[model samples]
Target: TKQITLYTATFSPYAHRVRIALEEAGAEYTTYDVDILRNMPDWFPLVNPLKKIPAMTFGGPEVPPDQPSPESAKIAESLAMLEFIADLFPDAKLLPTDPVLRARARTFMALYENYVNGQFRDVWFLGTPADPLLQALEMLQGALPPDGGFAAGEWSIADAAVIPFLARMFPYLEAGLGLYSKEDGVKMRKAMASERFARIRQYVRDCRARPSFANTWAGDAEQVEAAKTVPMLRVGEHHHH
Candidate 1:
């Protein structure tokens, strides 16, 4: 048993993934919010060189989260932390042991990262059309069993990886929180509300019902309010890279 600390922010779905995984594992961990969007502590760079949220420090001598121990293992990236937590707590069965189910879990995680995450980025940050995002989401939803279950037919790291983004989709849309155009936003709202996308609505409901999600989440309204402060999500802001 070692001390675990997470550098996190409530607006960050990346951080939310690690929080859910830790909750699922029933792990005792410390959380320190860096507020990467508006205010970041100088020492946060020592925790994660990238200045990313969801950074983890493992196995260090107990110390305040701000003053990290050099001996502790510093970990970055939300998906990687999900795997590390699963490996750390075997009895939690964060992943199913069956090879096929494991593959499904891995595939679902990849599909979200590779195919879907960018769609949200495009529509929200760049104000791109929502059609592609909706299509990508349909494909992601199809990966789940129609019979009703998680990505691997059991709650797995895959669900944790995807839910934070998906969970925000509704509340953010309803709040008109994204940079998407009025027309596209209305279209997306109608589409998400219709029977054409019913399964995923159910999926979101099931995932949110879990204790892990409930505990880790900032609630829908609160999350939307926090997201408004994110520099990337700011309307009329464009990065020139």
Candidate 2:
């Protein structure tokens, strides 16, 4: 194992996924926070031509993050990075050893990516209606084990994949960091707080309770503070202060 270097930003939920996965792996890795969205470093594309956070340089000769070596495998995309960390550290048991349950983990990741991520972007970035977002979350809530466990029964990549967004929802909603209308914000906030979504609330708690989550999260207020700088989230909207 040469080294794993992760480019991250507090405002990025996707970056948070890789952060959690790396922490869970208990792997020795260096985290480099780059300003994205509003501003970006000129050298970032060397590490990931996608010019995105959560990219990793794996098995590369020891080099500074800003000067990523060409020899290292540049892993781009959040889920791809998540799976790479899991594969690289099998003893960490990042996924279930059981085939069916392992399928469940993949299914959970698929369910969130396919069904839920867009709704979050819409509601938070577009001030679009929140009903569909809430409904999609309800569908996702059903995917969690009814008996109270992490997605796929134990801590897995699936939980890391989904938790960042769900965890962000509560604090962001409360802090009013989204572009959604006051009414829809109130509506979605109520839905998330209501008894109708008890299972997912517990799911959030179970995942956040992990040491990996505790270590990775930037704290609700801190993340909200960072998210406010995202230009797309504000657009022409009025300021909160």
Candidate 3:
């Protein structure tokens, strides 16, 4: 009876952000998996011109049952889409409403994108050479805030966007294939083991502990289990530490 439709892929951190948000809001929705490795489908091209996953369409005849807006809403990009949905449904407020508080939440997301996400991704997926990764990791370690709570000191959209990356990064940090070296990752990881890190970890811990998180992983157990063995973290393991 819900008109919400979510398009996502098997192993996308961006997709995971939307998943967490929808689940937290208790929204009823159907998910369509996209195969990014292969050419996308025709209908998918209509939904997302760029053919990216984690796109969503909410509100229509099948959902809460509203009159159709003259224009269809097509939201792209994970962080922006998640925030848009959460704000649109304030009754399901996963984020704070106060201007300053909302700004702080955005701040954490921004920091993660700039300092943590990019550098870690560089080491794992991009072409960061060993020397640069070493220097990058050292610099990254110095830049992180000592793992305080979800960027805003509470459970928030920023938290939703961050957890999946931590889960995937653990083993990659071990392999040392990307921007992360064991030494730098280990030292920064130790910092995450502290109370500051514990708060952020706890927020995700609570979310994943829920039945919805369990079901999402179990529903796609085959792919999830296989990926459980890979590592992608090096530059920001401290965030998860």
lDDT of each residue in 55-107, candidate 2, tens digit only: 78888789989888999999899999889999999999999999999999999
What TM value does model 3 have? 0.69
- Which candidate should be chosen as best, given lDDT against the real structure? 1
lDDT of each: 0.91, 0.88, 0.61
**How does candidate 1 fare on TM-score?**
0.96
lDDT per residue, candidate 3, 1-241, as tens digits?
Answer: 3367778766777887888788878887778776654566656655677878777766544431122222456678898877776876678878887878878778767766776677666655544433443444344333324564455555677767766676555444443334444555665456546554454455556656765466555343444443443344223343211
Better of 1 and 2 by lDDT: 1
Q: What's the C-alpha lDDT at position 208 in model 3?
A: 68
Model 1 C-alpha lDDT per residue in residues 1-241, reported as the tens digit of each score:
8989998888999999999999999999999888787778888888899888888999979999989889999999999999999999999999999999999999999999999999999888988888899999999999999989999999999999999999999999898887788888889999999998999999999999999999998888899888988987876543221
Show model 1 residue runs off by greater than 4 Å: 235-241
Considering lDDT, which of the candidate structures 2 and 3 is the better prediction for this target?
A: 2
Assess every candidate by TM-score.
0.96, 0.96, 0.69
- Prediction 3 global C-alpha lDDT: 0.61
